[PDB]
């Protein structure tokens, strides 16, 4: 597929590439992603102000996280919502306020994740551990997976 | 000259001895700080 240059780099960003964001992990725990080459904007007949990258996806035989897609999406989005802050600041928004401090510590303790890791420095195995522990928490609490902290702040 | 003026002025200052008298006298008094100015630059007192 062709994407914009920035989106292609974010899709093909390694652990510790500035374009490392949600799309990087989201694409990479399921596919081998290769950003092959870039086309400058002058080559398109009505010339845009952006470049175009060409990315190749090959589905992975063994996905790096054995979890439902929407759960992983929620975990990754909440991790990356504050991309320059510590990771725990992003994980703590997955839980209601009352159980926020306790549940965040529990998740980090069971997942074996250093709280001082930033979102851009989290490998896919760290996300595997976080997703597994979050799945256990959601199984132990039916209504956790439907929590949206913005709606809680509306009240 | 300034020191002498201060000497004469100190005699009228409020002290712990004359606090009641001066307070009552003030309560029996009124001062007006308001005055207006005309287009010609003349003060108009109330």
């Amino acid at each position: 597929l062709t994407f914009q240059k920035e989106v292609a780099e974010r899709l093909a960003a390694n652990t510790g590439s500035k374009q490392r964001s949600r799309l990087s992990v989201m694409a990479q725990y399921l596919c081998n992603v290769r950003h092959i080459f870039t086309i400058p904007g002058q080559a398109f007949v009505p010339k845009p102000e952006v470049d175009v990258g060409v990315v190749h996806f090959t589905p992975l035989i063994q996905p790096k996280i054995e979890q439902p897609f929407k759960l992983v999406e929620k975990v990754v989005q909440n991790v990356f919502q504050f991309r320059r802050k510590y990771c725990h600041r992003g994980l703590r928004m997955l839980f209601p306020e009352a159980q926020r401090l306790e549940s965040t510590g529990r998740l980090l303790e069971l997942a074996d994740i250093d709280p001082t890791l930033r979102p851009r420095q989290l490998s896919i195995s760290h996300f595997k551990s976080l997703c597994d522990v979050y799945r256990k928490m959601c199984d132990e609490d039916p209504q956790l997976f439907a929590y949206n902290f913005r709606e809680e702040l509306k009240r | 000259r300034e020191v002498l003026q201060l000497q004469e002025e100190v005699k009228n200052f409020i002290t712990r001895e004359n606090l009641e008298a001066r307070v009552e006298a003030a309560l029996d008094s009124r001062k007006n700080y308001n005055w207006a100015i005309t287009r010609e630059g003349l003060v108009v007192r109330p």
């Binding site: - | 020191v3 201060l6 000497q7 100190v10 200052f13």
Partner: protein, 161 residues
């Protein structure tokens, strides 16, 4: 130490009959009922009487040094309470540099007055460093090792001889 609060203002100290006034007048014309600047002026006058040969000539190097020393003390007192006042920290550092320059000039020009100023104002003159380079971690570590190794070599040579 500061002048006592009962001290009269420099402006009202030589007025004739100023000892024949009411205690209220004395308080009104004292440092207790004035701003810090009058107290600093009294400090400067005290230093001038104590140190300089002619306490009236304020254009000499020693008088300027005394005045800037009083100002530096005032800035230090201000910054003791106002830790985050960057402007006054700058003013203090610049005043210290200026006083160092004046002290260098006085030392090069008049040593007796320089010594009298240093004793009277409690200033310990320090010579500038010869080189201005960053003492980074590697440099300090290597220098410490060199000093330690020299000490060990001295011990070994003493034992040998």
């Amino acid at each position: 130490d500061d002048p006592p609060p009962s001290t009269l203002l420099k402006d009202y100290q030589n007025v004739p009959g100023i000892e024949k006034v009411d205690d209220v007048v004395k308080r009104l014309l004292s440092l207790e009922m004035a701003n810090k600047k009058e107290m600093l002026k009294i400090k400067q006058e005290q230093f001038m009487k104590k140190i300089v040969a002619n306490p009236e000539d304020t254009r000499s190097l020693e008088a300027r040094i005394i005045a800037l020393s009083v100002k530096i003390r005032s800035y230090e007192e201000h910054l003791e309470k106002h830790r985050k006042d960057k402007a006054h920290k700058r003013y203090l550092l610049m005043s210290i540099d200026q006083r160092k320059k004046m002290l260098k000039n006085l030392r090069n020009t008049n040593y007796d007055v320089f010594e009298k100023i240093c004793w009277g104002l409690g200033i310990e003159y320090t010579f500038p460093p010869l080189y201005y380079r960053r003492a980074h971690r590697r440099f300090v570590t290597k220098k410490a090792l060199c000093i330690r190794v020299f000490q060990e070599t001295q011990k070994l040579k003493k034992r040998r001889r």
